Specification:
Elements: H1 3-23, E1 24-33, E2 36-44, E3 50-58, E4 81-83, E5 93-94, E6 101-102, E7 109-114, E8 123-129, E9 155-159, H2 164-168, H3 182-197, E10 203-213, H4 215-225, E11 235-239, H5 255-262, H6 271-280, H7 283-289, H8 296-300, H9 325-329, E12 339-344, H10 352-357, H11 384-397, H12 405-429, E13 437-442, H13 453-456, H14 488-506, E14 533-537, E15 541-545, H15 549-556
Parallel strand pairs: 2-4, 8-9, 8-10, 10-11, 11-12, 12-13, 13-14
Antiparallel strand pairs: 1-2, 2-3, 3-7, 5-6, 7-9, 14-15
Modified residues (N6-methyllysine): 6, 17, 37, 39, 70, 88, 195, 282, 302, 330, 356, 395, 491, 527, 533, 553
EC number: 3.1.1.-
Modified residues (N6,N6,N6-trimethyllysine): 151-152, 533
Length: 566
């Protein structure tokens, strides 16, 4: 990121402190939890709404010392009133703007927001699990402000969880108790806390909705698949991701050794010596070196990050993913709750930046062999079946003789999002009956209101609706501003928070109190449907055949001779 963008950002951080102070009131309030009393504070929004904010509620013990890399443990209660008027730190990560490591190992907190602590009936509870590819992200209100959702009579809860190697180290050695998925277990513990405390803030414990974008969508899906959480909630929304995306799963058991060697470990490769070195390293060193972990072959095969959700190599009381995610889908409790999924209209525009720095990536479309699903491709990607499968992808996305940047981004929308969504819908349809799933397509472009991911993807000036572009209409962030009530941006905020709030309430996202949705009727997807229908959300709200469908079928035709793997 440029020095100019670094200065703008710093300035915005400073402005934000002042905006935050102005928006804070002297009305404090105390609420009860299973663990003790917490003190929150009422705050305003730039729309002159107001809400009670409780931040820094621990849902687990600080995962430090011998707790590093282990399943989270329940937090220790207190008497007195814990101060929750301030935010806690974020999980240790590289700051996307400054490129310096920030955060702290002491990051297992959640934040609770609502326009009314004593409503007359228990309200729908919405739980946001943030994205950031399992390596960045936070619940700070400078990027995930509840300002818009608190117009609605809901309780909104934003969680943190362990990221990177500290959340996702995995070791085969059973004696060590580092099976993997610590960060997802953080998520489970947070959802247990919410279940058992949401009533104290006016929330209905029998009507919880979990939602997330990108890796938060994968996370939400995982919360719908694991037995650890059976029955804990009642709706799920998967925004631009799910647990069977190729980026959402990795076998990272050999990678802890590599990480340790990068950090200076001297010795042989066994799990115990490797863990002991890692248990004593400074956390920022681990996180800083993590970008060097993956090999050239791994990157070429599109393994996105060294550490993430994995198949745990042995069972424990706290195991979250005992099998591959596909196999988990077959028996998932969450298959039986109302579900909404969707994507943006030009997801792969996100990768503009990566294309800038590596223009030769476009030549991967000459044969598209690097985009064939790794379960079907040979190791060197030189087999004749692999060239054939690559030709399906090429014919779907390469529009002229020579591939372009756009063809590459369009193919990416599919590889990363539309194709795994299709695999999931069909897989799910065969291992459930009845419970509806609804689709949306987010297709509203503006550069008047943005979020910080735009600075990360170097998308200033770039037309089309990228991965992350919808977040802007759900959450306040420090680059936002008060928009006129008549603005198309403002209307999109109301439509988005409105639809999400409707679905959370009844499990059906249709309502005719939402403007633009009067000549609409929003049917769920049926197992027999050959073409998917979605609510396309742009300046107009309109049901349409998913425009991506034709390409989706073409990707599917790569499994012609291996139907059992699709």
């Amino acid at each position: 990121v440029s020095l100019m963008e670094k200065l703008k950002w710093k300035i915005k951080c400073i402005e934000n402190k002042f905006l935050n102070y102005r928006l804070t009131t002297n009305e404090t309030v105390v609420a009860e939890t299973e663990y003790g009393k917490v003190k929150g504070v009422k705050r305003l929004t730039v729309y002159d709404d107001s809400y009670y904010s409780f931040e820094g509620i621990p849902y687990a013990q600080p995962p430090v010392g011998e707790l590093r890399f282990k399943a989270p443990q329940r937090p220790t209660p207190w008497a007195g009133v814990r101060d929750c008027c301030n935010h806690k730190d974020k999980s240790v990560q590289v700051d996307f703007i400054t490129g310096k490591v920030c955060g702290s190992e002491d990051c297992l907190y959640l934040s609770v927001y609502t326009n009314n602590l004593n409503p007359e009936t228990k309200r729908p509870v919405l739980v946001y699990i943030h994205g950031g590819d399992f390596i960045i992200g936070e619940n700070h209100r400078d990027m995930y402000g509840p300002d818009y959702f608190i117009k609605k009579d809901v309780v909104l809860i934003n969680i943190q969880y362990r990221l990177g190697a500290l959340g996702f180290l995995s070791l085969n050695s059973e004696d060590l108790n580092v099976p993997g998925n610590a960060g997802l277990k953080d998520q489970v513990m947070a959802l247990r806390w919410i279940k058992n405390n949401c009533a104290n803030f006016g929330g209905n414990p029998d009507n919880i909705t979990v939602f997330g974008e990108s890796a938060g969508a994968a996370s939400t899906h995982y919360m719908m698949l694991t037995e650890q959480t059976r029955g804990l909630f009642h709706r799920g929304i998967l925004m631009s991701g799910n647990a069977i995306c190729p980026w959402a799963n990795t076998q990272c058991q050999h990678r802890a050794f590599t990480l340790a060697k990068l950090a200076g470990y001297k010795g042989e490769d066994n799990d115990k010596d490797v863990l002991e070195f890692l248990m004593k390293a400074k956390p920022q060193d681990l996180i800083k070196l993590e970008e060097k972990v993956l090999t050239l072959e791994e990157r070429t095969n599109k393994v996105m990050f060294p550490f993430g959700p994995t198949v745990e190599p042995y069972q424990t009381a706290d195991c979250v993913l005992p099998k591959h995610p596909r196999e988990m889908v077959k028996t998932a409790w969450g298959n039986s709750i109302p579900t909404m999924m969707g994507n943006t209209s030009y997801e792969g525009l996100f990768f503009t930046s990566i294309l800038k720095q590596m223009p030769l990536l476009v030549k991967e479309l000459e044969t598209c062999v690097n985009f064939v699903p790794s379960e079907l491709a040979d190791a060197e990607r030189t087999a004749p079946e692999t060239l054939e499968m690559g030709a399906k992808i090429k014919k779907a996305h390469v529009t002229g003789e020579t591939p372009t940047a756009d063809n590459f981004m369009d193919l990416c929308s599919h590889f990363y999002f539309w194709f795994p969504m299709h695999r999931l819908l069909q897989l799910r349809f065969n291992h459930t009956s009845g419970t509806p799933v609804y689709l949306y397509r987010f297709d509203f472009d503006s550069e008047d209101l943005i979020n910080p991911y735009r600075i990360m993807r170097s998308g200033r000036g770039v037309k089309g609706v990228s991965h992350t572009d919808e977040l802007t209409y759900f959450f306040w962030n420090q680059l936002a501003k008060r928009m006129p009530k008549e603005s198309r941006e403002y209307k999109t905020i109301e439509r988005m928070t409105g639809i999400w709030t409707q679905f959370a309430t009844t499990g059906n996202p249709y309502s005719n109190e939402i403007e633009g949705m009067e000549n609409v009727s929003w049917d769920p997807i049926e197992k027999s449907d050959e073409v998917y229908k979605c609510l396309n959300i742009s300046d107009e709200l309109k049901m349409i055949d998913v425009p991506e469908m034709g390409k989706i079928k073409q990707w599917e035709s790569m499994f012609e001779k291996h139907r059992d793997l699709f």
